[PDB]
């Protein structure tokens, strides 16, 4: 019986209020800035490179993906901003590689395609990291991997950051071998030249497809030599369109059917518009908002069962459903306290026991600072949550909707704690500590330095100390700085939060949920 | 409980979110307020919080004035019994 | 627990069956009652060469003898003399 | 292909026959007696206690259950007669606790509610046993436990029978901890005062709900704080306070009133992320081909007369269809396959004195059901004295054990229904209480004891006739009934169904017309747990 | 490397002190009282019954055990005081049954022998409970069961407390069937008459032995009929001595070898005499002593590593070794506090993680009582320990060296929490609460009853209330009252504590230690 009427979250914001008007205007500008930058990245190398690419009879990398996935199906692209201003004088749109999750023959797959128009498809250090991140996502969720191979090899000027280390180019083949041993299909489509390590990708794949003349692993390589004499090729394709058609057939023969471990209920849209998040949140991290408002606009029917509502109120935990999937939501609503950490630790155990996916909404401002709090083991309480979150085996997704500073990042399932996905809003900031705190802390150390030493240190000497620090933390905490390197899986428009979460959780459910084993809880 | 009259019953009066200076007071000793009417603004550790009216009841009294430091969880406004 | 173990042993000397009630004391000694007489017995086994020797004290009297247990006969060799005691064979 | 026509059990009884008329009249009186006694137990403590309970704004315990379970769903109450005349001068309707299985948010759950109108909700020795039985049922079938806590603590005058032993009050928390470790949800709703030692029940639960004004949770009561530290505290301030909900954090949900708390409980169960899965094959249900109330005339209340157990089977199984196994071998025992509400069941029922062939036939049948993972139903009607057992009754000893050993090791769900006598070792072979059947029910005409009352009387009439014949002082026939009459009275009193049910030896006394419904509900609940593989011991061939 | 020098526990008591002299004198009297009462129980039914028993050619029940076990091996008897003054006018020494653990053919086995001299071997309600307790011990530790069957059937006058219920006589056969299915050998030796349910015991056993003429299951039963015609008998024995010899052969063919899951170190005697425990502890529960003194006199070399010594000092936890086995010791040193419960919960997790057996020393006086303590969730903290102790799967042994009242009993692994063994010292007291507290509590309720009602209630009216209560709790909390019923496994002399623990832990190690699964820790 599911006919019980229940309460719903959310309230109607005051659209006429000046705060709402200002917050909407600021957030809208950030979203528009995000959109137009992606449009530029969409063009890859440029008109001359794109014209040359088409002149050889090859499809553009993004057109290949469009033809590969099922007609009209959504495509979840990851790390669109990798390599954004990462290198001083070189522009590398998207890192030279396009990765994402789409549906092929009704099966969710990870698609990894080299962008030959960007530096001829050479592998920059960020390119390796982006690919390795994609492989990690595919393995953790048991998603078949499809490699649209068109590459020019490693970028020699930066070889030391590509070849040698464990997380360098060599790890790519290691991941392929491991996934194959686990029956996670590895499919390679040679749609261009692949040299040196590149030739290993088709060789290490379970099934392999090569284009008639474009692909090379012509006399030295070529489809004919490998297809008919070397035997490296499993399928022979006339052109790019033919190869993509063959790939769809290969996936259809995987003999795989998705099975769900969780209970399912009919989907319902939230009771409030998503674009209202612009006014509610804004771009000023100093102002505070009720995280429940964000929740009310992404969960099915804006229905939410809060757990321990009046205890540790700076943290919000409860049960909801997104697109029918059950989810346990943990979101910051203020400074973390001992009660908040205990409340979170209790909640995480509940979700792990029932095998319920966890969603984290990071908007942190730090931990409570005080002599009494330390005497009561706030560190001991904060550690309880870091330790429960780490050991949890349910799928975990993290969304940074605000600041992410210090140990608060770890407790809320930061990148170091292997969340299945990590996304950030365009207004987010991340660093070891807030820019102001680092400035103020230094303003104590050197005020002390010269007060204790005895040479006076004046107020103008203070901003010759504080202004460079604040600039550095603002620049390095910017979402684009974080996303240019692969620290998150993408910057997403707040209006798209519900859709992105729905796609992400759906992909994460391809793998069975394991039992959680915890360490010692330091009581 | 579904009627939301309960939401008024859950807490008798607004409390201070944290120990912080009162920066603004928007309510006189006797003022009619509706739920969501900002009553006070408080800065704690350089973080601005705006207190909002829990109920549509008229304000019986105010326990703090501007510039006062209010301790965490201390009553800020008294509302007339209805 | 809370009581002492007393063992009823039977030994044959010549044609006579001798009933011995042996009590295991906590200290490791033994209290043996034969007919109406009680004896306090304590001792240990030590080896000289290939011959096992029994060092015992009966009612405070200490003596040494060579002990051999073959088949169902106990052979005790002491400078006073040699004695053979037969262990009854269950039917 | 399931279109085959098959034979059906049952025959039309002779309604005009004098035996049927007498048997119906006697059984009907027993059922009417059972009904009116339950009506009295339904009232709990009484009008004054009930009026006081409502005056505090609290719902009556049975109204709480009605609001908790799904609208219109049946509720299977257990051990309604616990504490019936158990204590000399104290009336404890239902033992002070109400336990049963009902559907909450579409999930079968075990509901354990204290009856605050009965002795203020104090825990009598039978109260602990009834609760422990409910927890055992929930664990064996993986049923979530919901505790509607309104209790006054242990009954001090009888503390020695409540506190100390393994099956005493302490075991209640042990069961909660074990079920939680197995992912069997434990939900506590504090709808009234939680006394010293009952404060653990809210704390030991996975999720907890407390009522705003009525609920109080404190390990030490205001009096003990007053005695130990000379401090005076109101009950609300000491525990079940907004302190417990917020400052102490013991409370997971805060409820305005009883109705709000019950609504919250339904939401909590809906979030368990549990879905029932069946290990057995299912077929469409069919009603029996004969009326159930005819069981009154067929069975009656006279245990000396005998009836064909097949008649009972014909009136409870789907379509009165029954496939008998080894029909002509060991005919005193009936075994076969049937279906109740679509579930497959293997039925074992007594049809006379147990023989060597009957025991062997039963042992063979039990192995078959365990191999195929088929639930087992036992219908106990052990025969007592009269002509008596085989005079040697020696061969029977070797054969009887095999069946005791097969029945004990069987891991399929087992349900026992005592429709007649239950005496001696025949009880063990037919899955008595000692052999952990998932449920055990008895009809109002049943009798249970170590042996039949007559056999004990006759046996003593041999021992003392011998005592004085061998000694030499003559012992006359009138001396015989000064021996026999007290024995027969004792066994009749202690073998009565109410005596057995007052103590928790069975899970309830049920009207024969309700047998099919009770079995259907019980088997449905028992299927919430996966059926395990059966490991047998050595079969002494 | 194990050559490190370490500190040792214990201090030399002041033998000249008056307190020590008084405590030694009182405890000695209790031990002497315990010894002489056992001597009387040793005689069973009496001289006339014993003379009749021997006149039939049968051995006395305790002589049978002496001949069954290995020569000179210790025998751990259990529940010697079962049935002590339990029934108004009937004397049932030891409950009519002798149970204990001894070594047969080098294998630790549980021996269950009916005492035919006591009421002809009839089964009283306590007799069933004692046997069921023995079977529970054998199953939990995988000890083979040997039944020396000489019984007269159930005691008809008390049939309702023997036959019907789950823990009644029927459960005996259920236990035999379950142990057999687990390869825990069940051996029955019919050395007398067995009738009705008794005949099932030889039939339900894996291997069975019957004496030539004494045993009956003569024409109706008898060894010859069952041995040669019925086939119920597996071995045929001439007399009691022959049957015991056959039993030893049967055990030798079990093909069983003991394996230890724990690390072992050479044994060492404690550095202090055990009999000093008389002076240290005494018989006055109101006085307090340092539990470390008790520990120093039972652990190998008086070596003890204390855990969280300065936190929650009312509870003592640490690691030690008894006869080479590793053990984690938890003992009360005052009233339980929130810190003490947390400290215990942390310690129990450590032992379970490392698979270390746990020993509990119960000397409780209650929980801390106060408004502040309840506000801080003392109940929540106390529950943490009840829940950890219950789920622990390491072998657990409990020793009550003092009071055992209220919920403190549960937290310290009371009988309800299935410790492998539970022993009590002759000075112990157990009840729902202390006798004085029940008296004082009532002295508040009725002082209130008449102060609030308005009829005055005088001080002499107070002791007409208090004296009967104190007498009842003193009588029902007595060790003999607790031991007469099977609430503990025996009353032991303090000087024998080390030996009893060594034998008990050795037996408990016959079963492999399983992994511990905990519930939700309510943080
Ligand atoms: O004994 C008489 C009543 C007052 C003292 C009892 C103390 S208070 C501390 C401890 N906790 C209890 O529950 N009882 C004792």
Q: Searching chain D, which residue's CA lies closest to the CA of residue A339?
A: D249
Nearest by Cα to E325 from E495, E502, E496, E498: E502
CA dist E397 and A184 (Å) reads 50
Please, are residues A404 and A435 in contact by the beta-carbon 8 Å criterion? no
**Backbone phi, psi, residue C44, to 5°:** -155, 165
The burial of D268, by beta-carbon neighbours within 10 Å (0-12 exposed, 13-18 middle, 19 or more buried), is given as buried
A1: contact with D, CB 8 A cutoff = yes
Please tell me the total number of residues recorded for chain E in this structure: 523
What's the CA gap between E495 and E297, in Å, rounded? Answer: 9
D476 interface with A at CB cutoff 8 Å = no
What is chain A's alpha carbon radius of gyration, rounded to the nearest angstrom? 25
Whether residue E80 contacts residue E37, with contact meaning beta carbons closer than 8 Å, is answered with no
Cα separations in angstroms, A301 against A320, A322, A332, D260, E134: 9, 9, 22, 21, 60
DSSP string, A197-237: GGGHHHHHSSEEEEESSS-B---SSHHHIIIIII---SEEE
> Measured between alpha carbons, how far is D282 from D280 in angstroms, rounded to an integer?
6
* Most D CBs within 10 Å, among A304, A311, A315, A350, to test the D interface: A311
Report DSSP state, residue A162: T
Segments in B1-82 forming alpha helices (H): 5-10
| C-alpha dist (Å) from residue E64 to A235, E61, E93 | 84, 5, 17
SS3 content of chain C, % helix, strand, coil (to 5): 0, 70, 30
Find the helix or strand (DSSP H, E) in which D128 lies.
helix D125-141
Q: DSSP string covering D335-377, please?
A: EEEEEETTEEEEEEEE-SS--HHHHHHHHHHHHHHHHHT--EE
For residue A454, is it left (φ>0), alpha (ψ between -120 and 50) or beta?
A: left
What number does the ligand 1 atom closest to the CA of E367 have? 11
Nearest CA distance, E333 vs chain A (angstrom):
21
DSSP code at position B18 = S
Pairing relation of β-strands E315-322 and E305-306? antiparallel
CB A187 within 8 A of CB A144: yes
Compute CA A329 distance to the chain's CA centroid, rounded to the nearest angstrom: 18
**Which residue's CA lies nearest to atom 3 of ligand 1?**
E437
Q: Angle E186-E187-E192 (CA atoms, 0-180°, nearest 5)?
A: 135
How many other C-beta atoms lie within 10 A of the C-beta of residue A58? 20
What 8-state DSSP symbol labels residue D530? P
> What is the distance between the alpha carbons of residues A465 and D327, in angstroms, rounded to a whole number?
100
- Chain centroid offset of residue D332 CA: 27
Distance from the alpha carbon of residue E433 to the mean position of ligand 1, in angstroms: 9
Q: Which of A22, A334, A339, A369 to mutate to test the interface with B (most CBs of B within 10 A)?
A: A334
Interatomic CA distance for residues E347 and E350, integer angstroms:
5
Between helix A61-68 and helix A240-252 the angle, nearest 10°, is 40
Residues in contact with D283: Cβ distance below 8 Å, sequence separation at least 6, in sequence order: D2, D318, D339, D342
- Beta-carbon separation of B49 and A365 below 8 A: no
D67 CA to centre of own chain: 24
Provide the terminal-to-terminal Cα distance of chain A, rounded to the nearest Å.
Answer: 40
* E59-75 burial: b if 16+ Cβ within 10 Å, else e: bbbbbbbbbbbeeeebb
Enclosing H/E stretch for E256: none
Alpha-carbon distance of E16 to D538, in angstroms, equals 64
Instruction: Report yes or no: A80 and A94 within 8 Å, Cβ to Cβ.
Output: yes
**Residues E170/E159, Cβ–Cβ less than 8 Å:** no
Contact in structure between D124 and D96 (CB atoms under 8 Å):
yes
Strand partners, A397: A359, A421
- In degrees and rounded to multiples of 5, residue C24 shows phi and psi of -85, 110
- Ligand 1 pocket test, candidate residues E434, E439, E442, most atoms within 8 A of CB: E434
How far is CA E316 from each of CA A436, D164, E395, rounded to the nearest angstrom?
Answer: 47, 24, 19
- By C-alpha distance, which of D147, D233, D228 is closest to D194? D147
Site residues for ligand 1, CB cut-off 6 Å: D 224, 227-228; E 335, 366-367, 369, 436-437, 440
Using CA atoms, how far residue A35 sits from A28, A38, A63, A487, in Å, is 11, 5, 20, 20
Please identify among residues 321-380 of chain A the ones whose CB lies closer than 8 Å to any CB of chain B.
Answer: 334-335, 365, 369
Residue nearest to atom 1 of ligand 1 (CA): E437
- Ligand 1 center to residue D228 CA distance, Å? 5
For A262, the closest of D71, D242, D273 (CB atoms) is D273
Neighbouring CB atoms inside 10 A of E161's CB total 17
D336 bridge partner residues = D324, D347
B65 vs A: CB within 8 A: no
Dist CA A489 CA A133 (whole Å): 9
- E153 sits in the region (left: phi over 0; alpha: psi -120 to 50; else beta) called left
Alpha helices in D43-119 (DSSP H): 47-55, 61-68
In angstroms, the Cα distances linking E401 to C54, D331, E404, E429 are 43, 61, 9, 9
The candidate with the shortest Cα–Cα distance to E217, out of E229, E201, E228, is E201
Q: Which of D137, D22, D28, D34 is nearest to D498 (CA)?
A: D34
Question: What is the spatial distance between Cα E72 and Cα E66, in angstroms, rounded to a whole number?
Answer: 9
Report the Cα–Cα distance between both ends of chain E, in Å, rounded: 40
**C3, C24, C90 member nearest E39 (Cβ):** C3
Nearest to E174 by CA among E200, E210, E194, E140: E200
The chains in contact with chain B, meaning 3 or more Cβ pairs closer than 8 Å, are A, D
Q: If DSSP codes are grouped into helix, strand and coil, which group holds residue E330?
A: strand
D188 contacts D200 by C-beta, under 8 angstroms:
no
Q: How many CA atoms lie within 13 A of D58 on its CB side?
A: 26
Instruction: List the beta bridge partners of residue B21.
Output: B43, B69
Q: How many Cβ atoms sit within 10 Å of the Cβ of residue E7? A: 8
Q: How far apart, in whole angstroms, are the C-alpha atoms of residue D283 and residue D281?
A: 7
Contact check, Cβ <8 Å, E162/D217: no
> CB of E160 within 8 Å of any CB in chain D?
yes
Cα angle at D57 between D54 and D63, to 5 degrees?
A: 60
DSSP state of D320: G
Closest by CA to A155, choosing from A99, A92, A215, A199, is A92
Taking the CA atoms of residue A118, residue A120, residue A121 and residue A123 in that order, the dihedral angle to the nearest 10 degrees is -100
CA of B48, closest CA in chain A: separation in Å?
6
Judge contact between E106 and E84, C-beta under 8 A.
Answer: no
- The answer to whether E80 contacts chain C (CB < 8 Å) is yes
- Measured between CA atoms, how close is A362 to chain E, in angstroms? 22
Contact status, residue D199 vs residue D235, Cβ threshold 8 Å: no
E261 and chain C in contact, CB less than 8 A: no
Q: What does each C-alpha distance from E497 to D423, E278, E295 come to in angstroms?
A: 46, 12, 10
Nearest Cβ partner of B2 from A5, A11, A369?
Answer: A5
Residues 6+ apart with CB under 8 A from E352: E392, E393, E394, E516, E518
A307 near D252, Cβ under 8 Å?
yes
Beta-sheet pairing, B48-52 with B38-43:
antiparallel
Which member of D223, D229, D250 has the closest CB to residue E377?
A: D250
Q: Give strand pairing partners of E322.
A: E325
Q: How far does the CA of residue C50 sit from the closest CA of chain E (Å)?
A: 26
Q: Whose CA is nearest to atom 8 of ligand 1?
A: D228
**Alpha carbon of E373 to ligand 1 centroid (Å):** 14
Q: How does strand C81-86 pair with strand C73-78?
A: antiparallel
C-alpha–C-alpha distance, residues E382 and E367, integer Å: 9
Which residue in E349, E520, E523 is closest to A520 by CB distance? E349
Q: Which helix (H) or strand (E) holds D496?
A: none
Q: Are strands D447-449 and A305-306 parallel, antiparallel or unpaired?
A: unpaired
Give me the residues paired with residue A336 across strands.
A367
Q: How far apart are CA E454 and CA D145, in angstroms?
A: 46
Show the DSSP H helices in E165-217 as ranges: 170-181, 200-204
- Residue-wise DSSP of D170-215: HHHHHHHHHHHHTT--EEEEE-SEE-TTTTHHHHTSSEEEEETTT-
No. of H helices and E strands in chain C?
Answer: 0, 8
Inter-chain touch E349–A384, beta carbons under 8 Å: no
What is residue D109's DSSP assignment? Answer: E
Tell me the CA distances in angstroms from A248 to A71, A74, A223, A245, D36, one per residue in order.
Answer: 12, 16, 19, 5, 73
| CA D65 to chain centroid | 19
> In chain A, after which residues does the backbone break, taking C–N over 2.5 angstroms as a break?
217
Residues 6+ apart with CB under 8 A from A151: A114, A116, A121, A122, A123, A192, A193, A194, A195, A198
| Cβ(B42)–Cβ(B18) below 8 Å | yes
What 3-state class would DSSP assign to E399? Answer: strand
Identify whether the C-beta of residue E108 lies closer than 8 Å to the C-beta of residue E62: no
SS3 label, residue A311: coil
- Backbone breaks in chain B after residues (C–N over 2.5 Å): none
Residues B22 and B42: beta-carbon distance below 8 Å:
yes
d(CA D508, CA D37): 13
CA of E337 to the centre of ligand 1 (A): 14
Cα distances from A472 to residues A438, A461, A481, D420, E149, in angstroms, run 10, 18, 11, 89, 88
DSSP A411-459: HT--GGG--SEEEE-TT-EEESS-HHHHHHHHHHHHHHHHHHHSS---H
* HSE toward the beta carbon, residue D329, CA cutoff 13 A: 12
Resolution in angstroms comes to 3.9
Determine the Cα–Cα distance for residues C13 and E327; give it in Å rounded to an integer. 51
Distance CA D494, CA E163 (A): 12
E326 SS3 class: strand
Contacts of A160 (CB under 8 A, 6+ apart): none
Beta-carbon count within 10 A of A324 CB: 17
Report the SS3 class of residue D448. strand
The contacts of residue A376 (CB under 8 Å, 6+ apart) are A338
Pocket test for ligand 1, best of E332, E364, E369, E433 (most atoms within 8 A of CB): E369
The pair phi, psi for residue D201, each rounded to 5°, is -60, -45
CB atoms under 10 Å from CB of E446, counted, come to: 16
Instruction: Compute how many other C-beta atoms are within 10 angstroms of the C-beta atom of residue A356.
Output: 21
Number of neighbours of residue A57 by Cβ within 10 angstroms: 12
Residue A62: C-alpha distances to residues A94, A115, A117, A144 (Å): 12, 9, 11, 19
C3 in E contact zone (CB under 8 Å): yes
Ligand 1 midpoint to CA A59 (Å): 85
Question: Do A77 and A112 meet the contact criterion of CB atoms below 8 Å apart?
Answer: no
Q: Any residues with CB less than 8 A from the CB of D261 and at least 6 apart, and which?
A: D189, D191, D209, D210, D211, D253, D255
The CA-to-CA distance between both ends of chain B, in Å, stands at 19
Helix D395-409 crosses helix E170-181 at what angle (to 10 degrees)? 70
Partners of B18 on chain A (C-beta within 8 Å) are 334-335
What's the B27 CA to ligand 1 centre distance in angstroms?
52
**Which residue intervals of E43-124 are DSSP H helices?**
47-55, 61-68
D253/chain E closest Cα distance in angstroms: 15
Beta bridge partners of B36: none
Measured CA to CA in angstroms, residue D274 lies from A67, A317, B77 at distances of: 40, 21, 46
Q: Pick E353's closest partner by Cβ from A353, A520, A523.
A: A520
**CA–CA separation, D490 and D449 (whole Å):** 10
Q: How many CB atoms lie within 10 A of CB A178?
A: 12
The pick from D228, D230, D238 for probing ligand 1's pocket by mutation, whose C-beta has the most ligand atoms within 8 angstroms, reads D228
């Amino acid at each position: 019986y599911h006919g019980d009427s229940v309460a719903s979250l959310g309230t109607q914001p005051d659209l006429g209020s000046a705060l709402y008007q200002e917050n909407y205007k600021q957030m809208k500008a950030l979203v528009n800035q995000l959109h137009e930058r992606v449009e530029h990245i969409k063009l890859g190398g440029g008109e001359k490179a794109r014209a040359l690419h088409i002149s050889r009879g090859k499809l553009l990398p993004r057109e290949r993906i469009d033809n590969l996935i099922d007609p009209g199906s959504p495509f979840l692209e990851l790390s669109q901003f990798a390599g954004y201003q990462l290198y001083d004088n070189e522009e590398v749109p998207g890192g030279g590689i396009i990765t994402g999750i789409g549906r092929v023959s009704g099966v969710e797959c990870m698609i990894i395609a080299n962008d030959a128009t960007v530096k001829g498809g050479a592998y920059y250090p960020v390119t390796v990291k982006k690919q390795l991140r994609a492989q990690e996502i595919a393995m953790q969720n048991r998603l078949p991997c499809i490699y649209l191979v068109d590459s020019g090899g490693a970028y020699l000027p930066r070889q030391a950051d590509v070849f040698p280390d464990r997380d360098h180019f060599g790890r790519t083949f290691y991941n392929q071998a491991i996934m194959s041993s686990k029956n996670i299909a590895q499919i390679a489509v040679v749609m261009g030249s692949c040299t040196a390590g590149g030739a290993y990708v088709p060789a290490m794949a379970d099934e392999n497809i090569i284009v008639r003349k474009q692909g090379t692993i012509e006399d030295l390589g070529g489809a004919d030599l490998h297809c008919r004499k070397s035997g490296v090729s499993d399928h022979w394709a006339l052109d790019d369109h033919h190869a993509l058609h063959l790939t769809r057939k290969v996936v259809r023969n995987l003999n795989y059917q998705k099975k769900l471990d969780v209970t399912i209920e009919p989907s319902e849209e939230p009771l409030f518009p998503a674009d209202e998040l612009y006014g509610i949140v804004g771009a000023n991290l100093k102002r505070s908002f009720d995280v429940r408002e964000v929740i009310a606009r992404i969960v099915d029917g804006s229905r939410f069962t809060e757990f321990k509502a009046f205890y540790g109120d700076t943290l919000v935990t409860g049960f909801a459903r997104i697109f029918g999937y059950p989810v346990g939501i943990v979101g910051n609503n203020g400074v973390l306290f001992s009660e908040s950490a205990k409340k979170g630790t209790h909640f995480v155990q509940l979700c792990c026991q029932r095998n319920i996916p966890l969603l984290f909404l990071q908007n942190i401002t730090g931990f409570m600072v005080g002599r009494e709090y330390e005497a009561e083991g706030i560190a001991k309480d904060g550690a309880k949550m870091v330790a429960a979150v780490a050991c949890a085996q349910v799928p975990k997704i993290t969304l940074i909707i605000g600041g992410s500073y210090g140990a608060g990042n770890y407790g809320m399932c930061g990148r170091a704690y292997s969340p299945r996905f990590l996304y950030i809003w365009p207004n987010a900031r991340i660093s070891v500590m807030g820019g102001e705190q680092a400035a103020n802390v230094l303003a104590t150390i050197t005020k002390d330095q010269r007060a204790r030493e005895g040479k006076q240190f004046s107020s103008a000497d203070e901003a010759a100390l504080k202004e460079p620090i604040i600039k550095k933390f603002e620049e390095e905490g910017n979402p684009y700085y974080s996303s240019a390197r692969v620290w998150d899986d993408g910057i997403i428009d707040p209006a798209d939060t519900r859709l992105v979460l729905g796609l992400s959780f759906s992909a994460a459910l391809n793998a069975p949920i394991e039992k959680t084993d915890f360490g010692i809880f330091r009581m | 409980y579904l009627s939301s009259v309960s939401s008024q019953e859950t807490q008798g009066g607004p409390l201070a979110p944290m120990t912080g200076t009162i920066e603004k007071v928007f309510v006189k000793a006797g003022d009619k307020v509706k739920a969501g009417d900002s009553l006070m603004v408080m800065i704690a550790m350089k973080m601005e919080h705006t207190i909002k009216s829990p109920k549509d009841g008229t304000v019986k009294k105010v326990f703090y004035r501007e510039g006062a430091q209010a301790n965490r969880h201390t009553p800020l406004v008294e509302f007339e019994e209805e | 627990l809370n009581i002492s173990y007393t063992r009823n042993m039977t030994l044959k000397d010549g044609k006579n069956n001798v009933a011995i009630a042996v009590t295991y004391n906590h200290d490791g000694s033994y209290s043996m009652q034969i007919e109406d007489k009680t004896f306090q017995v304590l001792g240990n086994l030590y080896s000289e060469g290939d011959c096992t020797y029994l060092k015992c004290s009966v009612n405070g009297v200490a003596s040494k003898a060579k002990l051999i247990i073959l088949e169902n006969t106990i052979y005790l060799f002491s400078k006073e003399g040699s004695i053979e005691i037969d262990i009854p064979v269950p039917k």
